[PDB]
Each structure stands twice: as C-alpha cells, then as structure tokens.
Design an enzyme around this catalytic site. Structure first.
Site, PDB file in Angstrom:
ATOM      1  N   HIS A   2      -5.224   1.081  19.752  1.00 52.50           N
ATOM      2  CA  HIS A   2      -5.899   0.897  18.475  1.00 52.50           C
ATOM      3  C   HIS A   2      -4.888   0.897  17.328  1.00 52.50           C
ATOM      4  CE1 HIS A   2      -8.692   1.402  15.168  1.00 52.50           C
ATOM      5  NE2 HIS A   2      -9.677   1.140  16.009  1.00 52.50           N
TER       6      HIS A   2
ATOM      7  N   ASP B  82     -11.073  -6.266   9.821  1.00 49.84           N
ATOM      8  CA  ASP B  82     -11.345  -5.191   8.870  1.00 49.84           C
ATOM      9  C   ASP B  82     -10.159  -5.066   7.916  1.00 49.84           C
ATOM     10  OD1 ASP B  82     -11.458  -2.763   7.505  1.00 49.84           O
ATOM     11  OD2 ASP B  82     -12.291  -1.637   9.194  1.00 49.84           O
TER      12      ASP B  82
ATOM     13  N   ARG C   4      -8.720  -3.398  17.424  1.00 48.12           N
ATOM     14  CA  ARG C   4      -8.466  -3.437  18.855  1.00 48.12           C
ATOM     15  C   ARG C   4      -9.006  -4.751  19.384  1.00 48.12           C
ATOM     16  NH1 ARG C   4     -13.130   0.859  20.963  1.00 48.12           N
ATOM     17  NH2 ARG C   4     -14.084   1.250  18.906  1.00 48.12           N
TER      18      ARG C   4
ATOM     19  N   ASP D 170     -13.824  -3.372   3.714  1.00 48.73           N
ATOM     20  CA  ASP D 170     -13.712  -3.730   5.123  1.00 48.73           C
ATOM     21  C   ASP D 170     -13.832  -5.244   5.319  1.00 48.73           C
ATOM     22  OD1 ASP D 170     -14.477  -4.430   7.743  1.00 48.73           O
ATOM     23  OD2 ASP D 170     -15.572  -2.562   8.059  1.00 48.73           O
TER      24      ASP D 170
ATOM     25  N   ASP E 161     -15.141   1.407  -1.082  1.00 48.35           N
ATOM     26  CA  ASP E 161     -14.842   2.822  -0.906  1.00 48.35           C
ATOM     27  C   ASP E 161     -13.355   2.955  -1.200  1.00 48.35           C
ATOM     28  OD1 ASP E 161     -13.126   2.986   1.641  1.00 48.35           O
ATOM     29  OD2 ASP E 161     -14.887   1.901   2.398  1.00 48.35           O
TER      30      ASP E 161
ATOM     31  N   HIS F 276     -10.717   1.969   1.845  1.00 49.57           N
ATOM     32  CA  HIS F 276     -10.423   0.549   2.005  1.00 49.57           C
ATOM     33  C   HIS F 276      -9.707  -0.015   0.787  1.00 49.57           C
ATOM     34  CE1 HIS F 276     -13.393   0.664   5.383  1.00 49.57           C
ATOM     35  NE2 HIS F 276     -12.472  -0.134   5.895  1.00 49.57           N
TER      36      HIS F 276
ATOM     37  N   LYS G 191     -12.747  -6.697  18.935  1.00 49.07           N
ATOM     38  CA  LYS G 191     -13.593  -6.023  17.958  1.00 49.07           C
ATOM     39  C   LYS G 191     -13.426  -6.827  16.665  1.00 49.07           C
ATOM     40  CE  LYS G 191     -15.687  -2.523  18.065  1.00 49.07           C
ATOM     41  NZ  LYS G 191     -16.211  -1.220  17.549  1.00 49.07           N
TER      42      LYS G 191
ATOM     43  N   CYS H 126      -8.832  -2.708   6.155  1.00 41.55           N
ATOM     44  CA  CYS H 126      -7.884  -1.593   6.212  1.00 41.55           C
ATOM     45  C   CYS H 126      -6.777  -1.824   7.239  1.00 41.55           C
ATOM     46  CB  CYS H 126      -8.602  -0.264   6.498  1.00 41.55           C
ATOM     47  SG  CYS H 126      -9.345  -0.095   8.133  1.00 41.55           S
ATOM     48  N   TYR H 127      -7.049  -2.637   8.258  1.00 43.71           N
ATOM     49  CA  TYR H 127      -6.026  -2.911   9.264  1.00 43.71           C
ATOM     50  C   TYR H 127      -4.919  -3.783   8.670  1.00 43.71           C
ATOM     51  CZ  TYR H 127      -9.459  -0.829  12.334  1.00 43.71           C
ATOM     52  OH  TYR H 127     -10.364   0.070  12.854  1.00 43.71           O
TER      53      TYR H 127
HETATM   54  C1  LIG Z   1     -12.532   3.270  11.980  1.00 43.14           C
HETATM   55  N1  LIG Z   1     -12.527   2.719  10.599  1.00 43.14           N
HETATM   56  C2  LIG Z   1     -12.111   1.499  10.262  1.00 43.14           C
HETATM   57  N2  LIG Z   1     -12.249   1.385   8.915  1.00 43.14           N
HETATM   58  C3  LIG Z   1     -12.750   2.538   8.424  1.00 43.14           C
HETATM   59  C4  LIG Z   1     -12.903   3.318   9.486  1.00 43.14           C
HETATM   60  C5  LIG Z   1     -13.340   4.698   9.415  1.00 43.14           C
HETATM   61  N3  LIG Z   1     -14.459   4.788  10.375  1.00 43.14           N
HETATM   62  C6  LIG Z   1     -12.341   5.614   9.878  1.00 43.14           C
HETATM   63  C7  LIG Z   1     -12.677   6.691  10.737  1.00 43.14           C
HETATM   64  C8  LIG Z   1     -11.687   7.617  11.136  1.00 43.14           C
HETATM   65  C9  LIG Z   1     -10.360   7.470  10.679  1.00 43.14           C
HETATM   66 CL1  LIG Z   1      -9.112   8.653  11.136  1.00 43.14          CL
HETATM   67  C10 LIG Z   1     -10.022   6.404   9.835  1.00 43.14           C
HETATM   68  C11 LIG Z   1     -11.000   5.483   9.436  1.00 43.14           C
HETATM   69  C12 LIG Z   1     -13.944   5.073   8.156  1.00 43.14           C
HETATM   70  C13 LIG Z   1     -15.000   4.289   7.627  1.00 43.14           C
HETATM   71  C14 LIG Z   1     -15.465   4.500   6.320  1.00 43.14           C
HETATM   72  C15 LIG Z   1     -14.896   5.504   5.505  1.00 43.14           C
HETATM   73  C16 LIG Z   1     -13.857   6.329   6.020  1.00 43.14           C
HETATM   74  C17 LIG Z   1     -13.391   6.107   7.345  1.00 43.14           C
HETATM   75  C18 LIG Z   1     -13.262   7.322   5.173  1.00 43.14           C
HETATM   76  C19 LIG Z   1     -12.322   8.268   5.657  1.00 43.14           C
HETATM   77  C20 LIG Z   1     -12.619   9.651   5.566  1.00 43.14           C
HETATM   78  C21 LIG Z   1     -11.686  10.615   5.987  1.00 43.14           C
HETATM   79  C22 LIG Z   1     -10.446  10.212   6.504  1.00 43.14           C
HETATM   80  C23 LIG Z   1     -10.139   8.841   6.600  1.00 43.14           C
HETATM   81 CL2  LIG Z   1      -8.561   8.350   7.232  1.00 43.14          CL
HETATM   82  C24 LIG Z   1     -11.071   7.866   6.180  1.00 43.14           C
HETATM   83  C25 LIG Z   1     -13.688   7.440   3.832  1.00 43.14           C
HETATM   84  C26 LIG Z   1     -14.696   6.620   3.317  1.00 43.14           C
HETATM   85  O1  LIG Z   1     -15.021   6.720   2.133  1.00 43.14           O
HETATM   86  N4  LIG Z   1     -15.315   5.657   4.145  1.00 43.14           N
HETATM   87  C27 LIG Z   1     -16.409   4.814   3.581  1.00 43.14           C
HETATM   88  C1  LIG Z   2      -2.814   8.724   9.356  1.00 41.08           C
HETATM   89  C2  LIG Z   2      -4.176   8.424   9.913  1.00 41.08           C
HETATM   90  C3  LIG Z   2      -5.145   9.575   9.820  1.00 41.08           C
HETATM   91  C4  LIG Z   2      -4.490   7.225  10.440  1.00 41.08           C
HETATM   92  C5  LIG Z   2      -5.839   6.875  11.007  1.00 41.08           C
HETATM   93  C6  LIG Z   2      -5.881   5.428  11.444  1.00 41.08           C
HETATM   94  C7  LIG Z   2      -7.211   4.942  11.943  1.00 41.08           C
HETATM   95  C8  LIG Z   2      -7.772   3.793  11.133  1.00 41.08           C
HETATM   96  C9  LIG Z   2      -7.835   5.481  13.015  1.00 41.08           C
HETATM   97  C10 LIG Z   2      -9.161   5.004  13.525  1.00 41.08           C
HETATM   98  C11 LIG Z   2      -9.509   5.602  14.878  1.00 41.08           C
HETATM   99  C12 LIG Z   2     -10.896   5.295  15.368  1.00 41.08           C
HETATM  100  C13 LIG Z   2     -11.587   6.503  15.964  1.00 41.08           C
HETATM  101  C14 LIG Z   2     -11.481   4.066  15.291  1.00 41.08           C
HETATM  102  C15 LIG Z   2     -12.886   3.795  15.801  1.00 41.08           C
HETATM  103  O1  LIG Z   2     -13.769   3.398  14.761  1.00 41.08           O
HETATM  104  P1  LIG Z   2     -14.470   2.034  15.026  1.00 41.08           P
HETATM  105  O2  LIG Z   2     -15.165   1.925  16.355  1.00 41.08           O
HETATM  106  O3  LIG Z   2     -15.459   1.959  13.833  1.00 41.08           O
HETATM  107  O4  LIG Z   2     -13.293   0.987  14.838  1.00 41.08           O
HETATM  108  P2  LIG Z   2     -13.074  -0.545  15.127  1.00 41.08           P
HETATM  109  O5  LIG Z   2     -14.323  -1.341  15.457  1.00 41.08           O
HETATM  110  O6  LIG Z   2     -12.289  -1.112  13.927  1.00 41.08           O
HETATM  111  O7  LIG Z   2     -12.087  -0.417  16.281  1.00 41.08           O
HETATM  112 ZN   LIG Z   3     -11.635  -0.290   7.809  1.00 41.58          ZN
END
Ligand SMILES: Cn1cncc1[C@@](N)(c1ccc(Cl)cc1)c1ccc2c(c1)c(-c1cccc(Cl)c1)cc(=O)n2C
Ligand SMILES: CC(C)=CCC/C(C)=C/CC/C(C)=C/COP(=O)(O)OP(=O)(O)O
Ligand SMILES: [Zn+2]
Ligand SMILES: OC[C@H]1O[C@@](CO)(O[C@H]2O[C@H](CO)[C@@H](O)[C@H](O)[C@H]2O)[C@@H](O)[C@@H]1O
Lengths: 410, 315
Positions: free
Chosen positions: A234, A283, A277, A338, A345, A348, A280, A285-286
């Site tokens: 990932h 997005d 990954r 995203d 947010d 992102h 999928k 943030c990637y």
């Molecule tokens: C998986 N993903 C992809 N884009 C966003 C996300 C995420 N699911 C997410 C989950 C876990 C981690 Cl470690 C990183 C990113 C996600 C989606 C939405 C989110 C947040 C996080 C976060 C968030 C909250 C705490 C830590 C981190 Cl790294 C991200 C904040 C927020 O405001 N929004 C709307």
């Molecule tokens: C330093 C730090 C804390 C970095 C974190 C990086 C990061 C973005 C991790 C995400 C891990 C994760 C559990 C994704 C699954 O969400 P999903 O199933 O919504 O994701 P997807 O469809 O994009 O794979």
């Molecule tokens: Zn994202």
C-alpha cells in the site's frame, strides 16, 4: 507553438480516450467501481476543454488560504472525530500554508507552540490533545509543525530527553515499534520514530537495531510495502517504509527494482493520479504517498551510481499528476480532496498540495528542473521528500538540534 | 445501560451516582488553535473521562463511561487503553467484551483501535474460534478492508489455522478475480504452507494464473501474481513462459503482457543469454512501444529501463 493563453493537456488528447478501462466483458465489483470513477473524471476533464481553446489551469490559492486560515483557529463539532488528532490538524494546515507560501503570523505561531506544549506528555512524545497519552502519529505531526514554525521557541518546546525514552518504551525486539503504549504495530511507527528522532538528533546506535530488516520483511511479492510482513502493498505503508530506510541509510535492504516497478504502476493511465494499491481507486492524497516515492528512489539509485537516471524528471508522469490534482481535486469553496464528489478535509488539502509540489519540482545534485503546469502562480514551495516539510525547515531544524547532545548518550 | 442516543440518556453532570467526583475540563490554553466546538454531550462525557483518568479510578462506573466515550470518538486510543486497564482490574468477562467489540467493528470497520482491541482480547483468551467467521462477515461487506485482512493473517499464523484458507481464497477470487487483497492472501497461504519450491505447486499456480489471465487479460492483479511467484528465481529461468506469452501477444498485446516480455528480456540479459544483441534490440523496441504508445503514463519509467539496459548490456 501555442499562444501563452492556451496550454494543451495530456488528459485532453484524443488518444487519451484509449486509456479507458477495458473490462474484457467480465464485470466484477472492482471494474464497476473503476468505470464509475473514470466516467465522472472524463466529464470533469471535458469541462476544461473548449475545442482547440484550452485555458491554463489555476490553483485556487486564495480560496485554499481562507479555508486553512479558518481551520487553524476553530472547527465545528463535525470535527469531534479528530479530537485525538489535533496535532495532525496543526501540521496539515501549517504545511499547506507553507507550500502556498503564506506567512504564519507571529501570534499564530506562538499560539500553536503553546497548544502543542499542552499536548506533550510528561513521559515524552505528544498526544492527540491535552492530557491524552502520547502516540507516534501525533508526535510525528507535532514535531513537523514545530519545525515548520522553526523558531527557537518552537524547537525548545520538545523535551528531547523524554522523547528518546518514550521511543525506547515502544521499541520491540524484532525491530518494530508500537504506535503507542499497549498499541498496534505497523510500518507507520517506524517512520514516525525515525522522522522525529533524526530531526531532533536523538538517534542512538541501538534505537533502530533490527528496524531496517523488519521493514524489508514488509516488502512483499508485489514490490511495494505492506503494513506488516505478509500484508498487501500500500502506498501509505510503502512511503513510511522507504522514507524510514532513507533516514537510516539502509534503502539497499529493499529490492529497489521491484519497488520502482510497483509504484510507477500505481499511477492511473486514465485519471493521471495514483491509487493506493493495485485494483483500487485513484485518490488525491496518494499524489504524495505514492509519487513521493520517486524522489526517494531517485536518491537511492543515485547513491548507487545508476548511470541511467534522468537528470530532469522523476520517474512518473509529472504533467498527468498535476492535471488530476488541478482539475479534479480542488473544492471550489477552498481546500482539496480525494476525488470529485468527495468533501474537502485538511488531510487531503495537505497531501494534494504536497504531491503537486513534488510533481512541479525535480532536483538532483546541481540539477534543477521545474514543470509548472498552468499559470505561473501555481508554483508551490518545494517540500522535502522524507519529512514532507520545506527543505529549508529540515536544514534549519537539524542544524539547530545537532548542536545539542543526544540525551544521556556520548 | 443507556446509550448516547437513548431517549432516557442523562448527562453525567446530572447523574447522582457521579455527584461525588468533579469533572476535569480540557485545558486548551488562553488562545486555542484547532479548537473543536464540542457538543454539550461530547464535552460532558470527556470532562468526566478526564476526571476518572486523572484519579486512575478502576471502577464499574468508569468502565461504563468508556463505552460512551468510545461511541463519541472510537479513534481515541487513550480511552481504549484505559478500558483495557479496567477490563483487567475489574476482571470483566472477556467473552462479553468480545460481543461488544464485534458490534463496534461492524459499525466502524475502518478504524485501527477497534481491530487492535479485538486482537488483544483474542490474545488474552487464546481463543480464535470466532475469528475466521467474524472476519468473513466483515469482508462480505467490504472484500478489501485492509484491517480485516491483516487481522485474518495474524489469527491464521498465530493459531495455525491454514487448513481452509486456500478454499476461502478461491471462493473470493471467483466472486471478484480483480480483488488484489485476495491474490495477496493466496501468496500468504502458499508461501507459509507448501511453499513455492515444490515444482508441482509452482506449476499448479502458474497454470491457474495463466488461466485467469486468459479469462480477464487486462486484470493487473493476475499479471502481478505471475511475476511475483517467479521473480526471485528469475523470469529467464522459465523458457516456456516466454514462448507462451509470445503466442498470445498478437491477440493480447495489452501493456501488461508487453511489460512482462521486457521483464523477461531484462533477466535474460542479466544471465548471459544466447543472442544477447537480438534480445537487447527486442527489449529496447518494446520499451519504446510502451513509452510512446501502449503505456505512455509510464514513459519516464520505460525510457529509464531502456537506458539501464544499454548501460548494462550494450557491450
Ligand atoms: C485510507 N485513506 C486514503 N485517503 C484517506 C484515507 C484515510 N482513510 C486514512 C486512514 C488512515 C490513515 Cl493512517 C491515513 C488515511 C482517511 C480518510 C479521511 C480522513 C482521514 C483519513 C483523516 C486522518 C485522521 C487521522 C490521521 C490521518 Cl493520517 C488522517 C482526517 C480527515 O479529516 N479525513 C476526512
Ligand atoms: C505517516 C503516516 C501515518 C502515513 C499513513 C499513510 C496511509 C495513507 C495509510 C493508509 C493505510 C490504510 C489502512 C488504507 C486503507 O484505507 P482504504 O481501504 O480506504 O484505502 P484505499 O482504497 O485507498 O486503499
Ligand atoms: Zn486519500
Ligand atoms: O518484491 C519482492 C522482493 O521483496 C523481498 C523483500 O525485500 O521479499 C518479499 O517478496 C518475496 C516474493 O518475491 C517473499 O517471499 C518475501 O516474504 C517478501 O518479504 C525480496 O526478497 C524480493 O526480491
């Protein structure tokens, strides 16, 4: 060529339509979802084209600035779900402002420092809010935010002696780290620990013993890195893994060839952005977690003397990524996201801008080559590929802390 | 007893059984930043949570309170930690807690804390009897939930429950052969059971994968798995594979097949293959085709590969 008021786009070329998903007439949940995103993205792409007239893309700086400025101060109860991630908010917002080259008022800087001080635990590290237990995620965020501020006031907030003791309290025998006391283990911890320890100059010879090997075990058959050994590759965990190894100077512990091929394959041929990954969705943030791996790989390979490395571009489609971010990830009301249809947010907003900056700036040795798509004002401040804060902030912080001794160690 | 949304829910500051303890407000300093304007109910619960935490009160009332704190923000790891401290101090029935965590994860399956809590419970009980079925239910709702798959691998490996996982993998691949998480589980199961060194197993896997590729030529996961199980030994060590892919090229010139050919040629050149000049020319031609027509999004990568090949084998 073309008049200055019209700039042809990769995503708008007629051949680009051939990059649409080919489901081989076999439908599954995966192909159905992918096709739905592509359909929406094509509509978006088309709205930026007026036959042969293709106006320059614009990063809505001021709208993003106002959204960020407001969030740094107050938030509605809609943010209750982030009550344990406030230092993250400080970091995402400050880094976004930094990328946009928006100065941080002295009063705001002082208030942030005071707030992060309240988040610091007496046992070392930072918690998600005042009185909360320390955790590596908010610790990583707090240290980065303090370094972005970069004043001695900010630097001195960090209790380095307790921070190192705290890291020790999370270190496992197999080289991994817990995210917090009695917490879970995954590669995020290794990166958070390595990041704060290198920035504050508290790394000891034994702190990361076995860590490089544990991270290598996380790289899987795909070439990317999973959260723990055996898990699916990932972008989030791959960034953490490689960035931590770069800090430890152990990138060669990985198969860089399979990693390079894996990450480059994560850029979507149609959307232009990156997916997290295989199979999928794209997005925004990637744009950082994935694309940010190219500057790291470039540096890794360059250290090995790779004679085939480019001297002007990263090994991903820099223009296509900028097109996805600028056309599909901007909220008209300010902030980024995203993908189209999602709500904005601060997370992102931070990573879409961080990725845009990486896409605009190439740098290797004395070689510097910029590719700023759209109006010139779109150019963002550069960001360090390892820490994701301005490289100027990294240099100033490391220089400051290097003048201090490693807590109780010589 | 009563939930945060129940009609008879009462704020803690109004509960007589909580009158003896003073709430502890959150100190955000004189000039707060990223200040969340909490609802009255949210603040009420956390003001009391902070009180019990500060007094380290190991009580039944504190235990029930953590449940409300969790409902308000399941990502608050501090609350979760305290709850576990209470589970032990009060010697709470862990099977009861298991039923609780099951409902919580069903509601919020994309949260780190809820899955970690469940893992701790299973570790304390040394009882994985409910795991595979529970996870299967979560995956039935989201077949790619990362936390679910990670928890599944842990349970299987920790308690040696390998027996039926390959069958499970096959069922999910039938449902969605594009599910990359399932292909990962496939490698996980095989590498930990029979391994890939058994040539009969490897042959079975290559045939299976090739068959899936024929069914869905543009499914990247199958192509990645094919390369994944052969890359360590070296793609050039499988001479028949090259011919078979070469025969499908004319009718399946997808960028995945073309890229695989380059990968094969790369390895061949690295192993003193015969007709080096011919192999190199073919590889460079494909790199150009990929960079200019078939896989332009990766043009920088393909140009790099072209230059690498020349720096290593031009002689
Ligand atoms: C998986 N993903 C992809 N884009 C966003 C996300 C995420 N699911 C997410 C989950 C876990 C981690 Cl470690 C990183 C990113 C996600 C989606 C939405 C989110 C947040 C996080 C976060 C968030 C909250 C705490 C830590 C981190 Cl790294 C991200 C904040 C927020 O405001 N929004 C709307
Ligand atoms: C330093 C730090 C804390 C970095 C974190 C990086 C990061 C973005 C991790 C995400 C891990 C994760 C559990 C994704 C699954 O969400 P999903 O199933 O919504 O994701 P997807 O469809 O994009 O794979
Ligand atoms: Zn994202
Ligand atoms: O990308 C494959 C590459 O990763 C390493 C670790 O750096 O091993 C991973 O992949 C193997 C399959 O190719 C697995 O057997 C192993 O468990 C996993 O960690 C390298 O050895 C390999 O070249």
């Amino acid at each position: 060529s073309s008049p200055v008021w019209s700039e042809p786009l990769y995503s708008l070329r007629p051949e680009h339509a051939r990059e649409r998903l080919q489901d081989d007439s076999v439908e599954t949940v995966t192909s159905i979802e992918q096709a739905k995103v592509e359909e929406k993205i094509q509509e978006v792409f088309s709205s930026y084209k007026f036959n042969h007239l293709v106006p320059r893309l614009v990063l809505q700086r001021e709208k993003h600035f106002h959204y960020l400025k407001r969030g740094l101060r107050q938030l509605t109860d809609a943010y209750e779900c982030l009550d344990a991630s406030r230092p993250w908010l400080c970091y995402w917002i400050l880094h976004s402002l930094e990328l946009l080259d928006e100065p941080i008022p002295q009063i705001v800087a002082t208030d942030v420092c005071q707030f992060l001080e309240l988040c610091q635990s007496p046992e070392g590290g930072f918690g998600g809010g005042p009185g909360q237990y320390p955790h590596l995620a908010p610790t990583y965020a707090a240290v980065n935010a303090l370094c972005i501020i970069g004043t001695e006031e900010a630097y001195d907030i960090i209790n380095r002696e307790k921070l190192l003791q705290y890291l020790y309290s999370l270190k496992q025998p197999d080289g991994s780290f817990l995210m917090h006391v009695g917490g879970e283990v995954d590669v995020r911890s290794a990166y958070c620990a390595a990041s704060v320890a290198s920035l504050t100059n508290i790394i000891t010879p034994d702190l990361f013993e076995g860590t490089a090997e544990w991270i290598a075990r996380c790289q899987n058959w795909e070439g990317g890195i999973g959260g723990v050994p055996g898990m699916e590759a990932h972008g989030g965990y791959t960034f953490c893994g490689l960035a931590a190894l770069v800090i430890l100077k152990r990138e060669r512990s990985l198969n860089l060839k399979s990693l390079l091929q894996w990450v480059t394959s994560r850029q979507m041929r149609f959307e232009g952005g990156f997916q997290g990954r295989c199979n999928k969705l794209v997005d925004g943030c990637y744009s950082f977690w994935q694309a940010g791996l190219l500057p790291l790989l470039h540096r890794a390979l360059h250290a090995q003397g790779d004679p085939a490395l480019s001297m002007s571009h990263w090994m991903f489609h820099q223009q296509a990524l900028q097109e996805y971010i600028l056309m599909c990830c901007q909220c008209p009301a300010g902030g980024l996201l995203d993908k189209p249809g999602k709500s904005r947010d601060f997370y992102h907003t931070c990573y879409c801008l961080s990725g845009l900056s990486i896409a605009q700036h190439f740098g290797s040795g004395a070689m510097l080559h910029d590719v700023v798509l759209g109006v010139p004002e779109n150019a963002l401040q550069p960001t360090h590929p390892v820490y994701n804060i301005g490289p100027d902030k990294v240099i100033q912080a490391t220089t400051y802390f290097l003048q201090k001794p490693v807590p109780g160690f010589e | 007893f009563v939930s945060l949304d129940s009609p008879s829910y009462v704020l803690y500051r109004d509960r007589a059984e909580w009158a003896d303890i003073d709430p502890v407000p959150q100190n955000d300093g004189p000039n707060p930043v990223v200040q969340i304007i909490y609802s009255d109910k949210f603040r009420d619960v956390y003001d009391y949570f902070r009180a019990v935490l500060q007094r380290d009160e190991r009580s039944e009332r504190a235990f029930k309170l953590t449940r409300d704190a969790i409902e308000l923000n399941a990502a608050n790891y501090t609350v979760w930690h305290f709850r576990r401290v209470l589970l032990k101090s009060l010697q709470k029935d862990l099977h009861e807690e298991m039923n609780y965590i099951t409902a919580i994860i069903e509601e919020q399956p994309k949260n780190y804390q809820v899955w970690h809590h469940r893992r701790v419970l299973v570790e304390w009980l040394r009882d994985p009897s409910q795991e595979l079925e529970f996870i299967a239910d979560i995956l039935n709702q989201d077949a790619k939930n990362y936390h679910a798959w990670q928890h599944r691998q842990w349970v299987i490996q920790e308690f040696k429950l390998w027996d039926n996982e390959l069958q499970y993998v096959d069922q999910l691949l039938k449902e969605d052969v594009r599910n990359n998480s399932v292909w990962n589980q496939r490698y996980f199961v095989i590498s930990n059971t029979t391994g890939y060194n058994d040539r009969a197993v490897l042959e079975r896997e290559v045939q299976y994968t090739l068959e899936m590729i024929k069914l869905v030529p543009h499914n990247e996961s199958a192509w990645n798995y094919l390369k994944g199980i052969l890359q360590d030994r070296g793609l050039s060590k499988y001479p028949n594979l090259l011919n078979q892919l070469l025969d499908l090229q004319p009718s399946h010139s997808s960028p995945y097949l073309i890229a695989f050919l380059v990968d094969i040629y790369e390895d061949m050149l690295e192993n003193q293959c015969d007709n080096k000049e011919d192999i190199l020319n073919k590889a460079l031609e494909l790199c150009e085709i990929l960079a200019k027509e078939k896989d332009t999004i990766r043009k920088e990568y393909w140009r790099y590969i072209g230059r690498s090949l020349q720096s290593k084998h031009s002689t």
